[PDB]
Design a protein around this nucleic acid. Structure first.
Length: 56
DNA sequence: TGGAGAATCCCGGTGCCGAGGCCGCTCAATTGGTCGTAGCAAGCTCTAGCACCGCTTAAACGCACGTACGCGCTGTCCCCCGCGTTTTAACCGCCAAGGGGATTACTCCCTA
């Protein structure tokens, strides 16, 4: 059994920390631990990156 | 009237498939007892439904009389039927999708 640690990429931690900011109001925690598990898997699960352009 | 042909009947054969009957279970109908009530029986009031009389007039009705409208009769046509050809898409089969819902998993926190 080999443990393989890797840190949250800058996009993931932008998701994770703004999500964790909800703990300043709630604590829904069982909802948050599923959103935290999504971003810990891939942020496209939480918000799919897609072709984008400036504000019109 | 006759006739030909096209349309409908009837008779027998075939098949399939659904109705009628059988079997398990269950759960919902029945037995037995309690308790509340509700509506059934008496009694009182007096409300308004019925009957009658007399007057008023305005609504009904019998009949005169016309003319306005119902209907049969003629002509036209046009437009809907009937039947043959062309075309389309309804019906059937088979696979696909997914989409919804109920069960199961596991944390977190309310509430008893």
């Amino acid at each position: 059994e080999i443990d393989v640690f890797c840190e949250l990429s800058y996009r993931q931690r932008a998701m994770y920390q703004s999500l964790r900011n909800q703990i300043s109001i709630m604590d829904t925690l069982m909802n948050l631990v599923m959103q935290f598990r999504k971003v810990c898997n891939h942020p496209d699960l939480f918000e799919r990156a897609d072709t984008s352009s400036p504000f019109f």
